[PDB]
Amino acid sequence: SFETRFEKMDNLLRDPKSEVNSDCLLDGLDALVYDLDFPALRKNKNIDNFLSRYKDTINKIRDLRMKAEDYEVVKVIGRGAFGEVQLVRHKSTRKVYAMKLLSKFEMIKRSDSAFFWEERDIMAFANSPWVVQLFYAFQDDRYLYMVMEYMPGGDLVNLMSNYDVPEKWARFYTAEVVLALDAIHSMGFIHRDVKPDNMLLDKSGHLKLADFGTCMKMNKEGMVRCDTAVGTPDYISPEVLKSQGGDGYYGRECDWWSVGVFLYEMLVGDTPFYADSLVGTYSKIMNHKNSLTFPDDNDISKEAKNLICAFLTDREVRLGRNGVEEIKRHLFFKNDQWAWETLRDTVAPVVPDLSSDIDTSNFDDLEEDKGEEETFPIPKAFVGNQLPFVGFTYYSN
Amino acid sequence: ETRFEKMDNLLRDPKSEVNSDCLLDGLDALVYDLDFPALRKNKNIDNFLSRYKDTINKIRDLRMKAEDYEVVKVIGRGAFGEVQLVRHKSTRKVYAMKLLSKFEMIKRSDSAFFWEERDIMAFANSPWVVQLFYAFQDDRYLYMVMEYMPGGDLVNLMSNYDVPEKWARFYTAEVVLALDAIHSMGFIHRDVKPDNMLLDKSGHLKLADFGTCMKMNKEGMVRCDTAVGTPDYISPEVLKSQGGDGYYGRECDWWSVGVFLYEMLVGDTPFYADSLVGTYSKIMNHKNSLTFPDDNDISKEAKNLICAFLTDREVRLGRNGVEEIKRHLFFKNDQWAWETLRDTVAPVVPDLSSDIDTSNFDDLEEDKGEEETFPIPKAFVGNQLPFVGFTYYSN
Ligand SMILES: O=C(NCCc1ccccc1)Nc1ccc2[nH]ncc2c1
Ligand SMILES: O=C(NCCc1ccccc1)Nc1ccc2[nH]ncc2c1
């Protein structure tokens, strides 16, 4: 078991999960150079000499390390207000990826600069067939970049829009979502907004969760307190809505509420609390005991209705509070084609037809930003706008 | 691939500025220079420090640090710091450790000289040069861990013995070979004196204290306007360089060898005066002020070599190359040859009681005074920036 301090330090340098690995320490240097190199700061001789020593090295370093220029932008497949996601191809290797851009200017300006660490951690390290993998994270003075596996299947909002979804399909996607969420919970995170938008389909048509921006690490009780609120309330549980008003802590069962809403949406065609205003939806959700209604059309399988109602319910009695096994045993999951352990080896309901490795047909097309880069006022003294981003770089090795 | 390959080369190279040691020094320097209450008003700064607090604590502990060594005794003081005989608490190995005050070096300026000192000792790989094993630092000091030279220096030797011409010939010869090794690396030493000449356990000589060294241009010269060295040994060219126009070559080290030889044989320095000023004046006036006692018993050839060293640079012995020094008649002898000189039996082989024996160094008080240093930034100063990259591990 014993290791010398020298061995320990050496492990720290090579460990991908370490904040002191080489790539992380390169960040520090790179950031310091960015933030010190202005004519006013250079009147300090300490700073001026430091930068003279290090600027040859720093320019060559910035040249060797991975950079935005290493990738061609094929098309824009998503937009998030801190930036966007682009289909890219690497120049040397020709491999195709999805690349997320995050704007350092906006994050600083809007003073939301800490939110992406969970998403980095999850996608880099989950090592699960249920989670979009992060291959490379890098940065320049303007953006953070995340190079992810491309998911040409597109998302579940698209699929629900192009198809009428039978119970057999719904059972399949629901089950894959149950397993994805359990993987995330097992990593110690609560997702906090689960919804069709966050569910991507791969080449074989099997689901993975993407977009981990709202995830939070559970404490030892398995609880979190939402930091950021979220956007649309449609898939959000009552206890999460209430906690937004300062009330308290919630646990992972908030994610299972969302699955309930999702199931309902696939089967019924609308979300169960839908309303043409935000406040109308918020109200329906709080009033869920009364507001939850099953449709005119059909009596859909009672097992389905039963599962949905088991999810949409106060947290103390909600399905999943006793763990994921009680969910997997629900009669709604009983079927011929697959078992829980073999689920991902099954042939999927919709397998995408793809003309090229570049085919975006499952994504709504977006033009381009074409807007212009804003810059901070020039430092009169050390400001350190790059400091929050030190340690972001990551290379799967 | 090839991009990824060069990168981890830069990360490994002991001479690379992006190597692991430098990268760690960067972060460590950054944290020291940011962590103050005024600076923590800034949220970027405050959040960065909270985020790295535990890791910085961890790293400071894992890396080589002062508490790893036990201080046996203080064996020298340079006003920019001191040298301590130390024992590594774990390996039990003994070393000489120099401490250089960051405060003093910033205060007095001259914060760049330790770079070449570190490099010469780390990479010389010469029997004539004290080896550096490790260099490290904390917020207060730079540390250099060097081989210990239990023989002590030439000053201690001269205080204990009358030095016969036979010994003087040996030590001057070793000094000549050592200086030449340094010139071949591309440096002028500039502070050559008995105090910087150390004897190993077998009584053979090494140079130490390279803090005054300067790299020669491709012409073999340096351009410098500041008198350096120590008053008894300073050459007229270096003394003159004060207030402008100094351009000079390696032969200033040769001048100092002549002072050394005179002092061994005569028993006084050739330019001695009761004041610095008298000494500087005698040195500028050297053509007139240099005398030997009447009626001395010193040999002509010894006096000839001394006079051939202490004269104006353009005619100085060594001007044309080291060979003309080695051929001088004073060195002619049947005991040793130049190529094997360091394999012979030294004149005085020290008698040592333990690996800890200090008997060849003057007792130096450990403190006996008070402690202090540092000012406090209300904006980022970067007082640690000039030291980033100093840390070194021989490996
Ligand atoms: O498209 C998105 N998000 C859309 C909006 C957005 C949100 C935050 C930041 C920027 C944009 N994500 C994504 C992730 C991995 C992927 N692999 N393949 C497609 C694909 C898409
Ligand atoms: O003791 C000194 N120098 C004294 C003066 C000084 C100058 C600048 C900064 C601090 C002190 N040097 C030294 C070097 C290697 C050594 N190995 N063994 C002894 C031994 C001594």
Q: Check if the beta carbon of residue A20 is closer than 8 Å to that of residue B52.
A: no
Would the annotation count B81 as a binding residue? yes
Q: How far apart are CA B145 and CA B84, in angstroms?
A: 10
Q: How far apart are CA A36 and CA A116, in angstroms?
A: 25
Q: Check if the beta carbon of residue A293 is closer than 8 Å to that of residue A268.
A: no
Q: Gaps after which residues in chain B, C–N over 2.5 Å?
A: none
Burial of B171 by CB count in 10 Å (0-12 exposed, 13-18 middle, 19+ buried)? buried
B117 lines ligand 2 (CB under 6 A): no
Q: Enumerate the β-bridge partners of residue A129.
A: none
Residue A205 CA, ligand 1 centroid: distance in Å: 17
For B58, name the nearest residue in chain A, comparing CA atoms only: A9
Judge if A161 and A96 occupy the same domain.
Answer: no
Q: How far does the CA of residue A40 sit from the closest CA of chain B (Å)?
A: 13
Judge if A205 and A323 occupy the same domain.
Answer: yes
Q: Check if the beta carbon of residue B394 is closer than 8 Å to that of residue B133.
A: yes
User: H-helix or E-strand containing B137?
Assistant: strand B132-137
Judge if B139 and B222 occupy the same domain.
Answer: no
Q: How far does the CA of residue A90 sit from the closest CA of chain B (Å)?
A: 13
Residue identified by tokens 């201690």 is: B156
Active site residue B362: no
B75 lines ligand 2 (CB under 6 A): yes
On the CB side of A313, CA atoms within 13 Å amount to 13
Q: What is the DSSP string of B52-116?
A: HHHHHHHHHHHS--GGGEEEEEEEEE-SSEEEEEEEETTT--EEEEEEEEHHHHHHT---STHHH
Closest CA to A141 of A191, A43, A67: A67
Q: How far apart are CA B24 and CA A377, in angstroms?
A: 30
> What Cα–Cα distance (Å) separates residue B331 from each residue in B203, B268, B336?
19, 22, 9
B98 lines ligand 2 (CB under 6 A): yes
Of B80, B83, B130, which is best to mutate to test ligand 2, by the most ligand atoms within 8 angstroms of its C-beta?
Answer: B83
Residue identified by tokens 């996608």 is: A123
**Range(s) of the domain holding residue A386:** 1-154+354-397
**For B166-220, where are the E strands, in sequence order?**
187-188, 197-199, 205-207, 214-215
Judge if A338 and A387 occupy the same domain.
Answer: no
Question: Which residues of chain A are within 8 Å of residue B30 when distances are taken between CB atoms?
Answer: 28, 32
Q: How far apart are CA B55 and CA A21, in angstroms?
A: 11
* Cis, bond preceding B295 (omega within 30 deg of 0): yes
User: H-helix or E-strand containing B302?
Assistant: helix B300-309
DSSP class of residue B229 equals S
> What Cα–Cα distance (Å) separates residue B205 from each residue in B170, B178, B202?
10, 8, 9
Judge if B64 and B175 occupy the same domain.
Answer: no
Q: Do B6 and A44 touch (CB under 8 A)?
A: no
Question: Which residues of chain A are within 8 Å of residue B18 when distances are taken between CB atoms?
Answer: 26, 29, 57, 61
Would the annotation count A83 as a binding residue? yes
Q: Enumerate the β-bridge partners of residue B135.
A: B144, B392
Residue identified by tokens 């829980």 is: A340
- What the block records as the tokens of A132 is 């979009």
Q: How many residues are present in chain B?
A: 395
A231 lines ligand 1 (CB under 6 A): no
A79 lines ligand 1 (CB under 6 A): yes
The beta-carbon neighbor of B20 closest among A13, A114, A382 is A13
Q: CA geometry: angle at B393 spanning B390 and B395, to 5°? A: 150
Ligand 1 atom closest to Cα of residue A82: 9
Question: Which residues of chain A are within 8 Å of residue B382 when distances are taken between CB atoms?
Answer: 36, 44, 46-47, 50, 382
Q: How many residues are present in chain A?
A: 397
Judge if B120 and B66 occupy the same domain.
Answer: yes
Amino acid at B45: I
Looking only at the bridges linking them, the beta strands covering A134-139 and B152-153 are: unpaired
Name residues whose C-beta falls within 8 Å of residue B382's C-beta, 6 or more positions apart in sequence. A36, A44, A46, A47, A50, A382, B33
A208 lines ligand 1 (CB under 6 A): no
Judge if A235 and A134 occupy the same domain.
Answer: no
- What the block records as the tokens of A397 is 């090795």
Closest CA to A78 of A358, A356, A365: A365
Looking only at the bridges linking them, the beta strands covering B94-101 and A189-190 are: unpaired
CA B351 from centroid of its chain's CA atoms: 25
Q: Check if the beta carbon of residue A181 is closer than 8 Å to that of residue A259.
A: yes
Q: How far apart are CA A196 and CA A280, in angstroms?
A: 21
Q: How far apart are CA B291 and CA B268, in angstroms?
A: 11
Residue identified by tokens 């390290």 is: A125
CATH value at residue B113 = 3.30.200.20
Helix, coil or strand: residue B391: coil
Would the annotation count A194 as a binding residue? no
Q: How far does the CA of residue A224 sit from the closest CA of chain B (Å)?
A: 20
Dihedral angle, C-alpha A169, A172, A177, A179, nearest 10 °: 180
- What the block records as the tokens of A49 is 């000499």
Would the annotation count B152 as a binding residue? no
Q: Any CB–CB contact under 8 A between A317 and chain B?
A: no
The structure was resolved experimentally with X-ray
Q: Check if the beta carbon of residue A277 is closer than 8 Å to that of residue A285.
A: no
Q: According to the 3-state scheme, what is the secondary structure of chain A?
A: CCCCHHHHHHHHHHCCCCCCCHHHHHHHHHHHHHHHCCCCHHHCHHHHHHHHHHHHHHHHHHHHCCCHHHEEEEEEEEECCCCEEEEEEECCCCCEEEEEEEEHHHHHHCCCCCCCHHHHHHHHHCCCCCECCEEEEEECCCEEEEEEECCCCEEHHHHHHHCCCCHHHHHHHHHHHHHHHHHHHHCCEECCCCCHHHEEECCCCCEEECCCCCCEECCCCCEECCCCCCCCCCCCCHHHHHHHCCCCCEECHHHHHHHHHHHHHHHHCCCCCCCCCHHHHHHHHHCHHHHCCCCCCCCCCHHHHHHHHHHCCCHHHCCCCCCCHHHHCCHHHCCCCCCCCCHHHCCCCCCCCCCCCCCCCCCCCECCCCCCCCCCCCCCCCCCCCHHHCCCCEECC
Ligand 1 atom closest to Cα of residue A132: 15
Judge if B74 and B165 occupy the same domain.
Answer: no
Q: Any CB–CB contact under 8 A between A229 and chain B?
A: no
Q: Enumerate the β-bridge partners of residue B98.
A: B83, B144
DSSP class of residue B386 equals G
Would the annotation count A84 as a binding residue? yes
Q: How far apart are CA B195 and CA B161, in angstroms?
A: 16
Judge if A146 and A160 occupy the same domain.
Answer: no
| Integer Rg of chain A from CA | 24
On the CB side of B67, CA atoms within 13 Å amount to 5
Chains A, B: CB contacts within 8 A come to 89
CA A26 from centroid of its chain's CA atoms: 26
Amino acid at A164: D
Residue B356 CA, ligand 2 centroid: distance in Å: 16
Name residues whose C-beta falls within 8 Å of residue A211's C-beta, 6 or more positions apart in sequence. A119, A197, A198
Question: Which residues of chain B are within 8 Å of residue A384 when distances are taken between CB atoms?
Answer: 34, 42, 44-45, 48
Q: What is the DSSP string of B333-358?
A: -SS--TTTGGGS--S-----SSTT--
Q: How far does the CA of residue B394 sit from the closest CA of chain A (Å)?
A: 13
Question: Which residues of chain A are within 8 Å of residue B26 when distances are taken between CB atoms?
Answer: 25, 28-29, 32
Helix, coil or strand: residue B144: strand
The domain tally of chain B equals 2
Total Cβ atoms within 10 A of residue B314: 8
Residue nearest to atom 17 of ligand 2 (CA): B148
Total Cβ atoms within 10 A of residue A286: 15
Resolution limit, Å: 2.3
- What the block records as the tokens of B244 is 């402008």
Burial of B249 by CB count in 10 Å (0-12 exposed, 13-18 middle, 19+ buried)? buried
Q: How far apart are CA A288 and CA A285, in angstroms?
A: 5
Judge if B242 and B360 occupy the same domain.
Answer: no
Q: Can you say whether the dihedral through the CA atoms of A273, A276, A277, A283 is positive or negative? A: negative
Q: Gaps after which residues in chain A, C–N over 2.5 Å?
A: none
Judge if A37 and A97 occupy the same domain.
Answer: yes
User: H-helix or E-strand containing B223?
Assistant: strand B221-223
> What Cα–Cα distance (Å) separates residue A383 from each residue in A1, A28, A141?
44, 14, 14
CATH value at residue A331 = 1.10.510.10
Q: Enumerate the β-bridge partners of residue A87.
A: A75, A98
Q: Any CB–CB contact under 8 A between A13 and chain B?
A: yes
Q: How far apart are CA A288 and CA A44, in angstroms?
A: 64
Q: Check if the beta carbon of residue A181 is closer than 8 Å to that of residue A198.
A: no
Estimate the crossing angle of helix B300-309 against helix B165-184, to 10 degrees. 30
Residue A394 CA, ligand 2 centroid: distance in Å: 45
Q: How far apart are CA B268 and CA B11, in angstroms?
A: 52
Q: How far apart are CA B251 and CA B244, in angstroms?
A: 19
Judge if B296 and B318 occupy the same domain.
Answer: yes
